[PDB]
Ligand binder design. Structure first.
Ligand SMILES: Cc1cc2nc3c(=O)[nH]c(=O)nc-3n(C[C@H](O)[C@H](O)[C@H](O)COP(=O)(O)OP(=O)(O)OC[C@H]3O[C@@H](n4cnc5c(N)ncnc54)[C@H](O)[C@@H]3O)c2cc1C
Ligand SMILES: NC(=O)c1ccc[n+]([C@@H]2O[C@H](COP(=O)([O-])OP(=O)(O)OC[C@H]3O[C@@H](n4cnc5c(N)ncnc54)[C@H](OP(=O)(O)O)[C@@H]3O)[C@@H](O)[C@H]2O)c1
Ligand code: NFU
Ligand code: SF4
Ligand code: SF4
Ligand code: SF4
Ligand code: FES
Ligand SMILES: [Mg+2]
Lengths: 292, 255, 420
């Protein structure tokens, strides 16, 4: 968002960090934990609002900072949630955080999904692997604002059945969601012994309950699945002007100075922290190299 | 308290001396318990359980291979300190076999102790982290010890000395005088000491890992300025004598 | 019974071990086991380029890296027929004095002070003997900062190139160095008093052959062309192997040395005994006052001689800095062309005489011979440990071990330079 004096401090320092406390730790998968945070400043906690799809810079003191997307809805005011996978140094230190500990956060950064201009149209969310958390934010924003959006579909896929993000929440939500114009599809790709569904999301796009001409599509996951998902969506009649995807590059600041999250070419040179992380379909089509 | 042990293989004790001459070492005593460091302590026990083991020197004795196997058994983290432990040091500059050097130095006499050619510690055990230099910088020791005390680990360096040479504004010896500077392939952290004093880098901190040390490009640059192949190879193998990349990469550009 | 063995000797440079072979008639045999691995510096440098081979000679030890670097530069310059300018030689002497200050202060305060003060580590002496550790750190920092300014660093100096320096500091830095030496002179005085208060054990009283270098010029110093003896005779530096014999013992990786068939001693006490009359200033006043303690018969006078040498070398460094500042500005380095030759340089290390014999053939090293002070001192160390052990025979093993370790540490042994 455009929060003043709390996103850049009264000292006008964009690198200034806010003190937050971890209240709940929940292990989703083996290398995955869901963290519930709140700002130790009550006014800052009550004033901090974000957009679905935006990210924050989580500074573990003495180790470094990492960019994490927000998975909770912005209308759950006071608290925000982060889902973090153990990939290396900083995340190894993060996974040792027990409730009641204090960590530093600045944000929110980037542009989220344009959920304000998605008013009065269907929602199709396609989440692969770790991309469920930003789409969890979008999904919970849609569920809190159900009267605004039409039929919504949530496709969540993972390599194994134990690596599905928010499997318990989405499985518990499926009842009364099927009656509330919400369809949840959860599938695995490399697990042929999984009792549930199997296959890639492009197989389950046909099983969606969304009107193809009036649907907003949000895709999050590895860059390699994007081309196949684009082919499937274009074949079924989803308009290319409504397809949105998220990309990841190396980030050190999140404000546009370190120059590490660069994509594109000399014709269209862009930065993830300033021009994304949400990109449109035509941006992905025009310049190669944004995928893989 | 973190249990730290400093062990001496065949070395000049430069790394232990560098750690001992730091004024910040007085801050390590309240936060860490030094188990084995014979240079400063006399009550130090060799066979004890240490959280982090710092190993100095090359493996130039059979008893040293037994000691490093014991250290790997007894340590949760094994850290190789210095060029001698990381890449064999300057003792591995010569490719001549052990008996030739022994006959040249000690003549035809017996010592009853068994020596061997200088090899890095990584050949006999698994070193989790490395500290580079000869001797390593005080900043390297500070960063490594502090990150270990916080529970993290140091970040490996994959950038050349030229980075710190260009941050400090030092004149480039390779562009002006054509001197054989090994800086473009040597790991940073020394703040470009030798190029800042007008000398050329001899690569004490070692060549960059992760297969991004370009000896072929540097050999071509040296070849344009009138150096034979063997001079370039000896220069690059001064501290990188256990590197299999150097010979192949230079012979590629000279073929 | 069983030998009394110290597998690893602490607060001593390098890896070593004493072996006291006990017997019916007191002590029977003493072996000084040197388990530090051989690095073959005299063989790995053969056939290597001269400038590149000089950069790795200071890697023999860290306590006397500047000693090795400057002695190697002297040997190489003698081989190639080059004469350094007077101001460059003065700055090299200041760097060598910095090495001597650092090594002597480090030895005295962190290796032979804790065993006299009843501790097992200088890190345990932070709260009780606070002022002693503070002055220790100040002297060590002065030496380290002199080496950082002149050489590239305190260990393995890189600014010392063939024919001078790669880059010389500005004049104000030299003025600050002189001011800091003036401030550190009282610390040297306190160090000398503190080490005069200590004890020279009478169990090791005996006649010693003291070898030291004859200084060049008319002052106590480090550079020299002649080697003196307590027996009165003197021989040229290049003729060292006619009078000194190197032989290999079957219990150490080092070569023991003999002088006329007998062990001898090199070090600070030998320097004082041989060249006492060349001292000037507060060093000469202190030597004249305390000549009774500085008898060339007890190896434990070496620590006091080191304190006296610190006192002398602070003033000597001040004077050399004045001489160098008289000729400002200074060109950092002279162009040296490498002709063939054979140069032998005997500069006086903090622990004794350092002999560097280098032969140059077509810009490359063809013959290298290094004899280090500890290799000189090992035979006398064995003899004096034998007499100490026979004096303290059949006592408690711990007391014998600690007293033998104190005798060994009196020689400030650098095991790394022994094997080179
Ligand atoms: C917009 C965005 C949203 C993200 N959302 C999430 C999320 O919801 N959950 C989650 O688990 N992870 C998320 N990540 C990835 C997360 O930033 C990395 O897992 C983390 O930075 C790597 O930590 P590490 O300890 O492995 O660092 P190391 O591998 O040790 O590397 C150190 C530095 O590398 C940088 N870095 C490494 N990988 C990445 C990366 N993928 N993106 C940016 N910088 C990186 C960081 O600055 C980090 O400090 C997101 C990344 C981006 C760019
Ligand atoms: N957090 C967010 O909101 C967000 C947003 C954007 C990006 N991301 C990033 O996206 C990644 C998430 O994915 P992941 O790394 O966890 O993936 P992964 O599980 O390691 O592999 C991709 C998964 O998608 C399946 N898949 C489906 N269609 C595919 C296709 N066409 N090509 C390839 N795979 C296809 C794969 O099947 P196979 O195993 O058979 O290939 C596998 O199950 C993370 O790097 C995450 O940080 C996250
Ligand atoms: N002093 C001294 Fe050394 Ni480390 C010995 N022996 C070499 O100069
Ligand atoms: S790496 Fe260098 S400083 Fe360390 S022990 Fe080896 S030679 Fe000495
Ligand atoms: S002098 Fe050496 S280290 Fe410095 S920029 Fe030039 S090549 Fe790189
Ligand atoms: S410039 Fe090269 S030789 Fe000099 S300290 Fe740095 S890495 Fe070592
Ligand atoms: S994260 Fe630094 S430029 Fe975007
Ligand atoms: Mg020798």
């Amino acid at each position: 968002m455009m929060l003043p004096k709390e996103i850049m401090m009264p000292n006008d320092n964009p690198y200034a960090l806010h003190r937050v406390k971890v209240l709940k730790v929940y292990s989703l998968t083996e290398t995955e934990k869901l963290f519930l945070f709140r700002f130790e400043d009550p006014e800052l906690a009550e004033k901090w609002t974000f957009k679905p799809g935006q990210f924050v810079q989580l500074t573990i003191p003495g180790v470094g900072e990492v960019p994490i997307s927000i998975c909770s809805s912005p209308m759950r005011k006071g608290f925000f949630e982060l889902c973090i996978r153990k990939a290396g140094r900083v995340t190894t230190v993060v996974h040792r955080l027990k409730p009641g500990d204090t960590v530093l956060v600045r944000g929110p950064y980037g542009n989220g999904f344009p959920v304000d201009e998605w008013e009065g149209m269907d929602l199709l969310l396609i989440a692969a692997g770790l991309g469920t958390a930003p789409l969890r934010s979008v999904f919970l924003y849609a569920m809190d604002n159900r009267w605004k959006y039409g039929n919504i579909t949530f496709i969540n896929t993972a390599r194994y059945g134990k690596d599905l993000l928010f499997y318990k929440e989405l499985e518990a939500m499926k009842d009364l969601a099927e009656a509330e114009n919400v369809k949840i599809i959860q599938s695995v790709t490399r697990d042929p012994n999984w009792p549930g569904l199997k296959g890639r999301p492009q197989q389950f796009i046909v099983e969606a309950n969304t009107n193809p001409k009036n649907t907003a599509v949000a895709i999050c996951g590895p860059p390699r699945m994007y081309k196949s998902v684009f082919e499937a969506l274009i074949n079924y009649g989803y308009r290319p002007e409504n397809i949105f995807v998220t990309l990841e590059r190396r980030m050190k600041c999140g404000i546009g100075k370190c120059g590490h999250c660069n994509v594109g070419t000399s014709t269209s040179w862009k930065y993830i922290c300033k021009d994304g992380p949400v990109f449109t379909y035509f941006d992905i089509v025009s310049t190669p190299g944004l995928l893989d | 308290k973190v249990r730290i042990g400093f062990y001496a293989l065949t070395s000049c004790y430069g790394c232990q001396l560098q750690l001992a001459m730091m004024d910040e070492l007085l801050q390590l005593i309240p936060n860490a318990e030094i188990v084995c460091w014979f240079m400063i302590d006399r009550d130090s026990i060799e066979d004890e359980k240490v959280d982090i083991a710092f190993i100095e020197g090359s493996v130039s004795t059979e008893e040293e291979v037994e000691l490093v196997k014991k250290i790997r058994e007894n340590a949760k983290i094994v850290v190789a300190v210095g060029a001698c432990a990381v890449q064999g040091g300057v003792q591995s500059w010569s490719e001549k076999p052990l008996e030739e050097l022994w006959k040249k130095v000690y003549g035809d006499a017996k010592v009853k102790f068994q020596p061997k050619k200088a090899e890095p510690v990584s050949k006999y055990i698994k070193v989790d982290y490395n500290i580079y230099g000869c001797p390593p910088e005080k900043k390297d020791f500070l960063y490594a010890l502090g990150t270990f005390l916080i529970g993290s680990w140091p970040e490996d360096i994959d950038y050349p000395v030229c980075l710190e040479c260009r941050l400090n504004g030092h004149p480039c010896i390779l562009l002006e005088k054509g001197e054989p500077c090994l800086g473009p392939v040597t790991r940073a952290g020394c703040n470009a000491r030798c190029p800042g004093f007008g000398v050329a880098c001899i690569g004490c901190r070692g060549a960059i890992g992760y297969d991004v040390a370009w000896f072929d490009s540097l050999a071509k640059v040296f070849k344009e300025k009138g150096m034979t192949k063997e001079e370039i190879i000896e220069r690059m193998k001064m501290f990188n004598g256990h590197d299999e990349r150097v010979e192949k990469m230079v012979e590629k550009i000279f073929s | 019974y069983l030998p009394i063995t110290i597998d690893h000797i602490a607060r001593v440079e390098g890896k070593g071990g004493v072996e006291i072979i006990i017997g019916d008639d007191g002590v029977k045999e003493v072996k000084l086991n040197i388990i530090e691995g051989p690095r073959f510096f005299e063989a790995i440098t053969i056939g290597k380029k001269l400038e590149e081979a000089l950069a790795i000679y200071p890697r023999i030890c860290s306590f006397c890296s500047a000693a090795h670097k400057l002695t190697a530069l002297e040997a190489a310059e003698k081989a190639v027929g080059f004469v350094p300018r007077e101001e460059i030689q003065a700055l090299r002497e200041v760097l060598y004095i910095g090495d001597m200050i650092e090594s002597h202060a480090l030895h005295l305060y962190l290796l032979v002070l804790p065993d006299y003060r009843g501790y097992s580590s200088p890190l345990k002496m932070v709260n009780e003997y606070k002022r002693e550790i503070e002055i220790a750190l100040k002297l060590k920092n002065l030496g380290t900062w002199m080496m950082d300014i002149l050489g590239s660093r305190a260990i393995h100096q890189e600014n010392a190139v063939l024919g001078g320096f790669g880059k010389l500091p500005e004049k104000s830095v030299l003025e600050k160095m002189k001011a800091e030496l003036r401030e550190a002179l009282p610390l040297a005085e306190y160090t000398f008093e503190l080490f005069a208060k200590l004890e020279q054990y009478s169990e090791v009283e005996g006649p010693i052959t003291h070898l030291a270098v004859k200084p060049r010029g008319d002052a106590y110093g480090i550079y020299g062309d002649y080697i003196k003896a307590s027996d009165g005779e003197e021989f040229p530096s290049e003729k060292y192997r006619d009078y000194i014999k190197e032989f290999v013992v079957e219990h150490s990786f080092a070569k023991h040395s003999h002088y006329k068939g007998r062990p001898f001693m090199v070090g600070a006490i030998s320097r004082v005994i041989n060249n006492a009359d060349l001292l000037y200033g507060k060093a000469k006043e202190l030597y004249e006052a305390n000549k009774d303690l500085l008898k060339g018969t007890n190896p434990f006078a070496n620590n006091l001689a080191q304190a006296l040498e610190i006192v002398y070398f602070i003033e000597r460094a001040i004077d050399l800095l004045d001489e160098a500042l008289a000729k400002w500005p200074i060109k950092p380095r002279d162009e040296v062309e490498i002709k063939d030759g054979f140069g032998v340089s005997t500069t006086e290390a903090p622990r004794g005489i350092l002999v560097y014999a280098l032969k140059v053939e077509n810009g490359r090293v063809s013959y290298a011979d290094i004899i280090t002070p500890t290799a000189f001192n090992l035979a006398m160390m064995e003899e004096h440990v034998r007499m100490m052990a026979e004096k303290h025979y059949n006592d408690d093993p711990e007391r014998l071990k600690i007293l033998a370790e104190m005798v060994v540490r009196a020689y400030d042994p650098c095991i790394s330079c022994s094997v080179h």
